[PDB]
Write a protein that binds this DNA or RNA. Structure first.
Lengths: 441, 437
RNA sequence: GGAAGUAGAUGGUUCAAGUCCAUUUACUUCCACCA
RNA sequence: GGAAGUAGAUGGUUCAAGUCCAUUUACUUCCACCA
């Protein structure tokens, strides 16, 4: 299979077919009629209005253009008022910028209020660049919309499409900019192989530059890094994907993998081969949006992780899962059990004052002089990493993220061994320990 | 109690009785005759020849004065013959400088060939300072002989008297200098408390001066560090014992403290209480003098310790013992068992050539990326500190001292649990673990 | 909500804290939720 | 025999270890065995 042949087949995975374009076309018209009837300024932007949305995930963005002078609170009431007035059914869940999600004639719509600006310098709301993004792309993306989709499907299938916190990947917009820059998906990929953590792509200036971090300049706002929330590791994954793809291209790369059911037994055997302690801290899921949730789960992971490390449990890797009603903070450590006694350092032998303060303390064991300074043996209050975290999470819940922290305080438990393998975390477990052959399609 | 009171009763244990004195006096009379019907130039030196030896251990030092043109050839051969022809029974074991050790009418004697110089500068044989030590000390010590005797007794009861590598403590010539310097035992203990690791003591200039490290200057060799072999930790032990003695003076500071050994079962209980892995590497004690052995054992000890720590077993401390037949290298780790899997660091995601290489290796688990570099899981070859040191000891014998390495090469074993507790290391295991009572 | 910087104030730990664990006031950004 | 210092000779481990683990020559001391 030549590289150009795989792509022709890959287009079938990404070009929306007619039924979905029509559904979209008549959703759009209905939207128009409704927003006309209300006599409001609106515009269609995003992937629908540029024809770069993916087969299977049609969503229309309608943007409301308000006077710059409106208060943030006004922007909010009116935005919602109109969004609610126009959608067949709706749902309002956001993290900071207010907008309403909904459905019109079976199709998904964001209706998002923003400020009508003359320039996208000194943005007032965080969505203000969007109409300009559209304006800039409108006539550079014609005839390339399929190169965009290839890139989006390619990233989607390797789980790095989306700039949201759940993903820390590539936005659709970022994808569009890349095609405008390179000219095709193929050219994008060919070049990505040479991207580095210092790479700066400046599209408006048509230039690739070195800098302090991976930076993709927005043509609409030179200060914006379109790749701001692309995690370093996902960058590295993408360049790698590219290098692999060029060497051995297949339809594989455009097909997504789904984790496999793993018998809790295979899982038991694997864990005892590695000879490690594995456990999750399980707690009720705070009822909040993903974009609030995930940073906090990351915070929790790290915080506990660093505890495990400084208490010498030598943790290998951490992971986390949000499920329907619970969350899980997963860890794997090299030390299943540590000794009760440990060393604590005292002062040098010349500090009469402090030494005699130091060996004042009542201890089970005679303290000793080494390398000219004193040393004491103390007892740990926990000897296994599970006990360690039972203590840590009970007493440091406040540090663990505002919402998860409050959750952990109210309740949590530590699960390990087989009780843990029957829990919906096998996917993360395999991923975390790098278990071979546990994903598919 | 009141302090001078304490010294009174304590003098009785450092001072030799007429019984022991006479014993020497007449062994000295025999010596003086036997040496003079051979026309060999000689002088007596050391604690014997300045009335500063201890109740118990009595030794006599006889020094053979030799012409300087004599090579290390004629020095050894003649100087040995002489002692061999003077003593009743003798040994000739030594590390560098040759001498003969022996018995004359039931008392300990040392006869030592050396050069009769005039200048101690540009020294020839290792001991040549010693007759000059005496010349300097002869009349200077007169009176203060008791105050010396107290210092030695104090150090011996607290196990820090001597200079040999077994003790790395205080030479009995350093002990004399301190008394000479500070006047008495009480003033010596008094100022010791205020010594630092950089204290510099000079006697032929009487200056409590400071410098680069703990350096007591010999009168007869300005450039000689009489405290050279005193270990930092033992200097640290001394100035603390002094601070302790001063606050609560007791007879038990001259009573050699005995670690009356502990039951294999009370030991067992303690280690499971501490919850750590204690074990020893045991091998055939090489046939070498102490002053060769211990530095070597220290070396062997340290290398394994360092292995263990970089291997992440978190060793607590080391020790070592040498018996009739065997040496023991003792260790305690916080980690009885580590996981099989571990983390190996790959290159950074950019370096394409090296990534391929890192990825080409067969492993049981997929490698991963973390903060922009590749990592892999790999498997350990050992998971307990015992198995670990078995490996290190087999692979690295050559680096564990000349004679101790060779011995471990032939044979060694890893010794732990109750098998270990019935080996003659009970005392050192305590000292090491900080056990009380 | 999360992260980065600035100017601080606390508590705990420890012989010892500008250096470890945490708490907290003010300013300055920035990211996610739309693109 | 151990330690310190001067100029080098490698081998093993590893994606690469000029940095991790060891091997080896020349030279300049020091220290213990007596005090």
């Amino acid at each position: 299979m030549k590289v150009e042949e795989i792509l022709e087949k890959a287009l079938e995975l990404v070009i929306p077919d007619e039924e979905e374009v029509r559904k979209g076309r008549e959703a759009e018209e209905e939207l128009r009629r409704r927003l006309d009837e209300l006599g409001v300024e609106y515009v269609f932007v995003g992937s629908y209005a540029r024809n770069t949305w993916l087969k299977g995930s049609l969503e229309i963005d309608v943007f409301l253009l308000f006077p710059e002078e409106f208060s943030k609170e006004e922007l909010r009431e009116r935005g919602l008022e109109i969004g609610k007035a126009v959608l067949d059914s709706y749902e309002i869940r956001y993290a900071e910028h207010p907008y309403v999600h909904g459905v019109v004639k079976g199709v998904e719509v964001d209706v998002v209020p923003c400020y009508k600006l003359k320039e996208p310098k000194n943005i007032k709301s965080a969505v203000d660049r969007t109409p300009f993004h559209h304006k800039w792309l409108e006539g550079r993306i014609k005839g390339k919309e399929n190169e965009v989709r290839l890139l989006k499907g390619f990233l989607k299938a390797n789980g790095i499409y989306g700039a949201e916190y759940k993903v820390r990947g590539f936005s659709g917009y970022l994808c569009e900019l890349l095609i405008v820059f390179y000219g095709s998906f193929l050219e994008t990929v060919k070049n990505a192989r040479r991207w580095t953590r210092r790479t700066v792509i400046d599209v408006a200036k048509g230039e690739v530059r070195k800098g302090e971090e991976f930076f993709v300049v927005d043509p609409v706002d030179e200060k914006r890094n379109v790749a701001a929330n692309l995690s370093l590791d996902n960058l590295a994954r993408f360049v790698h994907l590219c290098r692999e793809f060029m060497e051995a291209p297949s339809l594989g790369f455009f097909k997504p993998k789904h984790p496999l059911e793993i018998e809790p037994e295979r899982l038991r055997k694997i864990v005892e081969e590695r000879g490690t302690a594995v456990f999750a801290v399980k707690f009720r899921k705070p009822d909040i949006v993903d974009d609030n949730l995930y940073p906090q789960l990351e915070r929790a992971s790290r915080k506990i992780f660093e505890f495990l490390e400084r208490e010498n449990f030598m943790p290998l890797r951490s992971a986390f899962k949000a499920s329907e009603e619970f969350c899980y903070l997963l860890f794997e450590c090299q030390i299943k059990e540590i000794s009760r006694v440990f060393r604590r350092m005292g002062p040098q032998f010349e500090d009469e004052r402090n030494v005699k303060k130091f060996l004042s303390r009542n201890r089970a064991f005679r303290p000793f002089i080494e390398n000219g300074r004193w040393w004491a043996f103390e007892m740990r209050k926990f000897t296994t990493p599970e006990e360690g975290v039972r203590s840590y999470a009970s007493t440091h819940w406040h540090t663990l993220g505002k919402n998860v922290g409050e959750s952990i305080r109210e309740y949590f438990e530590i699960i390990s061994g087989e009780k843990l393998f029957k829990e919906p975390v096998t996917a993360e477990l395999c991923e975390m320990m790098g278990v071979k052959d546990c994903c598919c399609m």
